[PDB]
A = this chain, B = another copy of it.
């Protein structure tokens, strides 16, 4: 392709329990799970330099990881948080 393309992201969300509704302040609370997936060749690496097949980051947001590895990543937020 001559022109640059947008990276495709797969998203999914599940709701486990509604834990509260506030009828005067008009807000509710929920517990659930979120999952994202995308493909980027710039994040690829060669196994022979680490002896591992999976490289993992834990206890960090997407923005923090993007700032650490100096690559653009699909950060997100909750609109009405």
Contacts and interface: CB of A to CB of B under 8 A. Distances in A.
Number of copies: 3
Contact of A63 (B17, B19, B59): B59
Interface of A: 17, 19-20, 24-26, 58-59, 63
Contacts of A19: 25-26
A21 to B, nearest CB: 10
Contact of A17 (B17, B26, B58, B59): B26
Contacts of A58: 63
Contacts of A20: 24-25
Nearest to A22: B19
